[PDB]
Amino acid sequence: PLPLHIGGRVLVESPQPVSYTYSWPAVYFETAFGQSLTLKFDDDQNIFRLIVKAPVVINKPGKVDYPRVRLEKLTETQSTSGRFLGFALPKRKRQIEFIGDSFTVGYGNTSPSRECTDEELFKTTNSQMAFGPLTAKAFDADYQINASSGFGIVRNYNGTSPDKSLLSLYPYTLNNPDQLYHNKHWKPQVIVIGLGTNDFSTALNDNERWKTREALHADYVANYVKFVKQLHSNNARAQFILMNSDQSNGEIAEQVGKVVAQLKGGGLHQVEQIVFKGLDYSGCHWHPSANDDQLLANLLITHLQQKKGIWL
Template identity: 45%
Template sequence: MWKSILLAGALATSPFAAHATTTAQMAYLLPMTIGGRVTADNVHQWPAVYFESRFTGPSVKLLFDNENSNFNVIVDGKPLMILQKPGSKVVELGKLGDGEHTIRLEKRSETQYLTGRFVGFDTIDQPSPLLPPPDRARQIEFIGDSLTVGYGNTSAFTQCTPEEIFETTDSQQGFGVLTARHFDADYQINAFSGLGMVRNYDGREHPKYHMPMLYERALFDDPTPAHQPDWHPQVIVVGIGSNDFSTPVRPDEPWGNEANLRADYVKTYTAFVKTLRARNPNAFILLTTLEGEPEGYISGTDAVFNAMTSGGDTKIDRITLPVLDYTGCNSHPNTRSDARAADIYIKYLEAHPQLWQGK
């Protein structure tokens, strides 16, 4: 899916490492290919969204309205720079050489309670722009929690402040993105740190959120359903539940004990997978857990898988990832672990090429 926008007027700008300018000229926003969940005007909140375009000439501008996210900028397939919380700026990239170029903007960070907007790519003198890169034939989706986000995965330390967690989280180095890139697939990383299927971390985190509710949305606090008519993943990987069983259930919680929590988890998770199946009748669904995780998470996921297969679903499987190296922020997996997990997914999909449905 791509779109082209004509923007009249100017965005406020300030000096920036690449080159920032103010402009009162008419800006022709280039057509873009967009990956991940965004609104119609490119407001985003989920991790790992990305924007791609093509242009001719030695320069291009990136127009932001985002004080809350960090981004990778990639030109002609090569990393160029990291933009940290660009705010309301027009960032100009110059001296790129004549001829045709591709440009890609990737969100690195996680923004649980804040949103941002990427206005678009601009080359003022190209009212007849090139078409953007086409949508990829393959699509893969990962649904999960902090492990899927890539929470603090580039950190050299296990103890991190909230700001350090933000700065060292790079969803583009998470196992989901690494897997997708290997197969040249478009991807969605629909994940939220601390979230569970029915109970969030310690039973206290993010009290107004849970995965079945957020999954329907493009923005977490906006109940408007995500609009993505062109999203038909061949593979959906679901790994969520470690937060549900992260700590013992307290007597004052709705479940009262772990047996009731497990029953609610299995019921809700099964309904969630059935919804995925109804919307994606041809997709192959992988239910995953990690070795060493709480028993309720592992056996509960087993129960969901058994419920789906006993109900006749043949496009589903259950895999277990090995124990990973938890040396990232707050004892989360680091990028080496992300690469190791990605390798397991890659080998699984290479052993089952039919899952891409001939694409």
């Protein structure tokens, strides 16, 4: 079993081969060295891409021996997990984290149709073609993509999972509250957060806890401000980009404007807003296409390239 470098949140267990368990999107594993290799899998949940040359697809291998190398998770798993059991490594000083919802995940980004069954949706979701991994790869930065489709700051798509939010999900290694994530070597100089579409895309239902739109605004702003504050207090070198669409009549963007003002008013000044525009939304269910993802990546790339000493 070769020494490994890991990107993304994984639970490491050492009973037998060391096992790596992951459920957040866009996880990867890299190795370096001979003239043979075998990847050991226990994953009937994900589609993967192996990069030795052009990428090769590995679809739901299950528990099998598969005979520089980069394995990248492509698909989204909100309710299940997958296991990888193993094979001079990359020493990337730059680190960037993307936090978000469907957009950040790459939900349906490679679908040529906006009409997708559940199966089509799973298969055409490619997190590695989403803006986050593209942006990271432009700077040769290690990346974590901590995102989950449908989730908001305080409110989720159409008031679904009212007991949850991206923020309640965020502290955990997997899609369950069994293990909290800590890695003292994970200290991204840049954090890009894209949340609010799900909080505001739909009207409040009568059985939700916000009884007026203003109450929702107030709760969203308060919690987003607190969130960036905790991230900062644990990582003094982080600089924040709060990224949102120009949709929902500007409601999302305005609440984020308030978040940014309030954070700066409180003394946390290393925070900026990006409002993105002009997407075709031609992926599944009117989500960003692969084209849209490249566009968004180009936006972030140009933005970060103008910031002196952003990585130091």
